[PDB]
Amino acid sequence: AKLQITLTRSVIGRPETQRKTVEALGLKKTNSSVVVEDNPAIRGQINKVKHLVTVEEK
Amino acid sequence: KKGVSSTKNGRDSESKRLGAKRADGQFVTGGSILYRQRGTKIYPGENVGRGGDDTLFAKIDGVVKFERKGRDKKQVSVYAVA
Amino acid sequence: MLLPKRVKYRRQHRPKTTGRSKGGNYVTFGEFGLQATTTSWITSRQIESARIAMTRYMKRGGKVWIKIFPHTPYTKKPLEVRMGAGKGAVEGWIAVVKPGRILFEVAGVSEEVAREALRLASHKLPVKTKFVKREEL
RNA sequence: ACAAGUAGUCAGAGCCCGUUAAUGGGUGAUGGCGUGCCUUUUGUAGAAUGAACCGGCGAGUUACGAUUUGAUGCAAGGUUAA
RNA sequence: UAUUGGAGGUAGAGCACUGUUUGGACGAGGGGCCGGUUACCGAAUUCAGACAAACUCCGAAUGCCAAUUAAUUUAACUUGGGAGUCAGAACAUGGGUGAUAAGGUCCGUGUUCGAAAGGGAAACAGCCCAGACCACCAGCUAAGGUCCCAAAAUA
RNA sequence: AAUAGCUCACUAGUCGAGUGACACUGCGCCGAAAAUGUACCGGGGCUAAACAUAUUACCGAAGCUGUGGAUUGUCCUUUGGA
RNA sequence: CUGGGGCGGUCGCCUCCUAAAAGGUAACGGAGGCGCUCAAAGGUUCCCUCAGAAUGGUUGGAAAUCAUUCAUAGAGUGUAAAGGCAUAAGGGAGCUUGACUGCGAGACCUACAAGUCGAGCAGGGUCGAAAGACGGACUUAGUGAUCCGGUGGUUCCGCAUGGAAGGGCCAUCGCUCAACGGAUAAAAGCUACCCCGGGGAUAACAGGCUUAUCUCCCCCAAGAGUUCACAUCGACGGGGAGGUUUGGCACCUCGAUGUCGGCUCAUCGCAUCCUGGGGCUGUAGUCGGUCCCAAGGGUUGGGCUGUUCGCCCAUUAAAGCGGUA
RNA sequence: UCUGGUGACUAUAGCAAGGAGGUCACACCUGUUCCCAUGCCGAACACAGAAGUUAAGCUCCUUAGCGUCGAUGGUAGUCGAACUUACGUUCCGCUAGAGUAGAACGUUGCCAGGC
Ligand SMILES: [Mg+2]
Ligand SMILES: [Mg+2]
Ligand SMILES: [Mg+2]
Ligand SMILES: [Mg+2]
Ligand SMILES: [Mg+2]
Structure with missing residues (x-):
């Protein structure tokens, strides 16, 4: 339904792919966060860069 | 810097940017090259022609679709509804 | 078992030495291996x-x-x-x-x-080895 | 006057002083951190180069023409040169 | 990014082609001799094995091109004025070259340094973590750690 | 130099519980010599202060929060706050 | 250009692999070709299918030609290689000249200049009964801007007018620039008499990395040694340590790090030359050989060469091997 | 579904074998005078004819020898990650080739006569 995303790890030293994905999710700085609606399109991006972010059911 | 030792193979040509030039689904205008080749990796199909250089170009406007011919051969088509 | 009698290209790129045996993993002709x-x-x-x-x-x-x-x-x-x-x-x-x-x-x-013969062969050889019998069962 | 120091900073007792009065000035036992500056380089504490120290002097300006931007006249017209 | 559609022949496998190869069947040619016999030797034909950057009946992962299209983001292109750059470096990974040598050399793909301070690695441009607008004698953590040097478990 | 032959083929009995081999592993041992001074833990030192597998704390940055302050940009006008 | 120059090789085009399954991608990397050829090896219409193999035979060097069933093309395609090809793009045969003129929406490539592919539209054809196909060879190399000059067309320019000489445009030729984007399309050498501006961007010295070479150590144990792998010595092979040699790399030093021998002075390692302790032995003791522990000390004087080294003459208990720019 | 055209599909469509059948369609056949006919045959091609016969081509039916297709499970490889310097290890997606079970002696569109 709704899930909350936070960029726990940094983005320095990671490929431009993972940089642009993090930009697409709308996360700006380390430990920044956003709330978006559960959606296979969004899950595709979280799964691609799960090692930098974390999820919550909020 | 060594001396007299010399090799008889330091030569090559300029590669030709062959291969695909359009993809299934996009609107090509007529004349658009779809696949520059040698011999026939892909034969022309509907509304597609064969250049002198084995080049494949659309006859008319429309979408592009790659398909199978028989068992081990592929063709190309163009369809106009747009 | 020394040299190929002829090869097409005499100067070749060195072989890959990373991975597992493509084949020849079984005793087929002899009894022990x-x-x-x-x-x-x-x-x-x-x-x-x-x-x-x-x-x-x-x-x-x-x-x-x-x-x-x-x-x-x-x-x-x-x-x-x-x-x-x-x-x-x-x-x-x-x-x-x-x-x-x-x-x-x-x-x-x-x-x-x-086993003794293959042991003596193993020492003239640059790779760790193992004694095996014709796999059955 | 038991100490190992690119010489500062930061933390601080003790001792003297008192201002452009403001949460003040001088010195600093002792602790923490810390290899000048320029040039040139992939990279310089560099044992690469340059300067002993102070002071003065010491390097993209001007003429004409072209282009572009801003500005101002006024506009199917604008403008003079000798 | 999710979902479709597609070009291509790498990794891996495989021997159907070009070859490279180890054993075993099976009949036979020039020839041991008198066209010969038998050994063989040059292959034909099989069965089991294997090898390959310039082999492929096969064939991924991923990259790439595009969509009737979605969802999240915020760039993108055109014209004009001004440039600097053409000595790169190391790590990780796919390869050539060398000797499966070099802090070697030449490519591809990231990252970092260059042009990056801060914490860790004793010290240590390139490694790990992380990008410094300016205070504060506030708080939480990442990599690394918690007996003393030296903040934290002699858990 | 013929040979001198006891003991683990072999067990009653000295007497009475065990004893060959095999794999596949976890951690060590040996192989192991270089030039100023330990000098192949940063030092002390460590039988855990090593290693493995869990668990729970805490420290740790100029990262990220907290409070105050610049300076630009985009919004609301909350002409002020975001 | 160049793993410093020099010497050797190379320089533009096409094909293949390296190239990591789009495209692209480098090395003095691994392989080869081109500077043409075809008036049919072009266009079109209609026909036809191949190499080899045996069941084989007038020849039969074997297989020439001929025969017959299988032949996935194992053959041919003018040439290098790679993609293709029985729709045949392969092989005949008949007509033929499209190996057309004027162009081109659109795309590919790409810094530029160039290069590449084009449906279609006119003109006029050729082939075919017609539909239709044809702006060269199955595809991809066969080449070289620009100035200058020559030849043919066309004047539309041509100085007061007419005409001309000269130009322009359109064909086309002609350098030959192969160092193949071509410094005038005229041209080789030595400087130890050298000079200036630069560089550790780049060599000689040593420092650093590596350890191919080099010194030493090991492992396996055929074997020699009467017998006997293992006193000693150890082949074929295999694994290492060291950083003393010959090198490789080009990282500090060219606004200077004096380089070889000898002299003076040493200092440190031990893989020890003597001396001390031992295990051994194919050691009866003296003898020697081997291995282990050992670095405290000691470890000559001369002849010959600049020599280090090495040889030689005398001694000594020994006349050690290396690091230290 | 018979029968003949025609064409749509990756040979699940093919080859070999055995067996039928000629329902007037199909090939076989008689000949070269007739257009035509062949670098070189009435071979073919073309043509006039239909007296012979299904034998073969063709058609239909069987059979998996032969051909092709071919899972699941897995393994190799690898995208991303975390260790790491090992000819590596771990986790997570994706997921071959080979082989094995098996599918398979076709499905099918329009037309014309059939029944
Ligand atoms: Mg200095
Ligand atoms: Mg100094
Ligand atoms: Mg000076
Ligand atoms: Mg000079
Ligand atoms: Mg100096």
Whole structure:
């Protein structure tokens, strides 16, 4: 339904792919966060860069 | 810097940017090259022609679709509804 | 089991030495066999040393099958030369091996004699080995 | 006057002083951190180069023409040169 | 990014082609001799094995091109004024070259340094973590750690 | 130099519980010699202060929060706050 | 250009692999070709299918030609290689000249200049009964801007007018620039008499990395040694240590790090030359050989060469091997 | 579904074998005078004819020898990650080739006569 995303790890030293994905999710700085609606399109991006972010059911 | 030792193979040509030039689904205008080749990796199909250089170009406007011919051969088509 | 009689291209890119035995992992001709557990080259000259040791130790007894053939040529540049100016000339023939690649097979001789012969072969050889019998069951 | 120091900073007792009065000035036992500056380089504490120290002097300006931007006249017209 | 559609022949496998190869069947040619016999030797034909950057009956992962299209983001292109750059470096990974040498050399693909301070690695441009607008004698953590030097478990 | 042959083929009995081999592994041992001074833990030192597998704390940055302050940009006008 | 120059090789085009399954991608990397050829080896219409193999035979060097069933093309395609090809793009045969003129929407490539592919539209054809196909060879190399000059057309320019000489445009030729984007399309050498501006961007010295070479150590144990692998010595092979040699790399030093021998002075390692302790032995003791522990000390004087080294003459208990720019 | 055209599909469509059948369609056949006919045959091609016969081509039916197709499970490889310097290890997606079970002696569109 709704899930909350936070960029726990940094983005320095990671490929431009993972940089642009993090930009697409709308996360700006380390430990920044956003709330978006559960959606296979969004899950595709979280799964691609799960090692930098974390999820919550909020 | 060594001396007299010399090799008889330091030569090559300029590669030709062959291969695909359009993809299934996009609107090509007529004349658009779809696949520059040698011999026939892909034969022309509907509304597609064969250049002198084995080049494949659309006859008319429309979408592009790659398909199978028989068992081990592929063709190309163009369809106009747009 | 020394050299290929002819090859098409005499100067070739060196072989990949990372992964597992594509095949030859079973005793097919003989009864007992010797497989490898690391992966080095074999230079068409250490297997020659090994088959001699085995054959002469069996006193012309049972049969032997060498399972590795030295196919790849290798190059070495002439001495005291700088870098560049082409590729060097062929110095020997090799055959890369992998962990699990059977190397030598024997039959028609008792088990202990075969194990001793393959032991003596193992020391003339640059790869850790293992004694194996014809897989059954 | 038992100490190992690119010489500062930061933390601080003790001792003297009192201002452009403000959460003040001088010195600093002792602790923490800390290899000048320029040039040139992939990279310089560099044992690469340059300067002993102070002071003065010491390097993208001007003429004409072209282009572009801003500005101002006024506009199917604008403008003079000798 | 999710979902469709497609070009291509790498990794891996495989021997159907070009070859490279180890054993075993099976009949036979010039020829041991008198066209000969038998050994063989040059192959034909099989069965089991294997090898390959310039082999492929096969064939991924991923990259790439595009969509009737979605969802999240915020760039993108055109014209004009001004440039600097053409000595790169190391790590990780796919390869050539060398000797499966070099802090080697030449490419591809990231990252970092260059042009990046801060914490860790004793010290240590390139490694790990992380990008410094300016205070504060506030708080939480990442990599690394918690007996003393030296903040934290002699858990 | 013929040979001198006891003991583990072999067990009653000295007497009475065990004893060959095999794999596949976890951690060590040997192989192991170089030049000013330990000198191949940063030092002390460590039988855990090593290693493995869990668990729970805490420290740790100029990262990220907290409070105050610049300076630009985009919004609301909350002409002020975001 | 160049793993410093020099010497050797190379320089433009096409094909293949390296190239990591789009495209692209480098090395003095691994392989080869081109500077043409075809008036049919072009266009079109209609026909036809191949190499080899045996069941084989007038020849039968074997297989020439001929025969017959299988032949996935294993053959041919003018040439290098790679993609293709029985729709045949392969092989005949008949007509033929499209190996057309004027162009081109659109795309590919790409810094530029160039290069590449084009449906279609006119003109006029050729082939075919017609539909239709044809702006060269199955595809991809066969080449070289620009100035200058020559030849043919066309004047539409041509100085007061007419005409001309000269130009312009359109064909086309002609350098030959192969160092193949071509410094005038005229041209080689030595400087130890050298000079200036630069560089550790780049060599000689040593420092650093590596350890191919080099010194030493080991492992396996055929074997020699009466017998006997293992007193000693150890082949074929295999694994290492060291950083003393010959090198490789080009990282500090060219606004200077004096380089070889000898002299003076040493200092440190031990893989020990003597001396001390031992295990051994194919050691009866003296003898020697081997291995282990050992670095405290000691470890000559001369002849010959600049020599280090090495040889030689006398001694000594020994006349050690290396690091230290 | 018979029968003949025609064409749509990756040979699940093919080859070999055995067996039928000629329902007037199909090939076989008689000949060269007739257009035509062949670098070189009435071979073919073309043509006039239909007296012979299904034998073969063709058609239909069987059979998996032969051909092709071919899972699941897995393994190799690898995208991303975390260790790491090992000819590596771990986790997570994706997921071959080979082989094994098996599918398979076709499905099918329009037309014309059939029944
Ligand atoms: Mg200085
Ligand atoms: Mg100094
Ligand atoms: Mg000075
Ligand atoms: Mg000078
Ligand atoms: Mg100086």
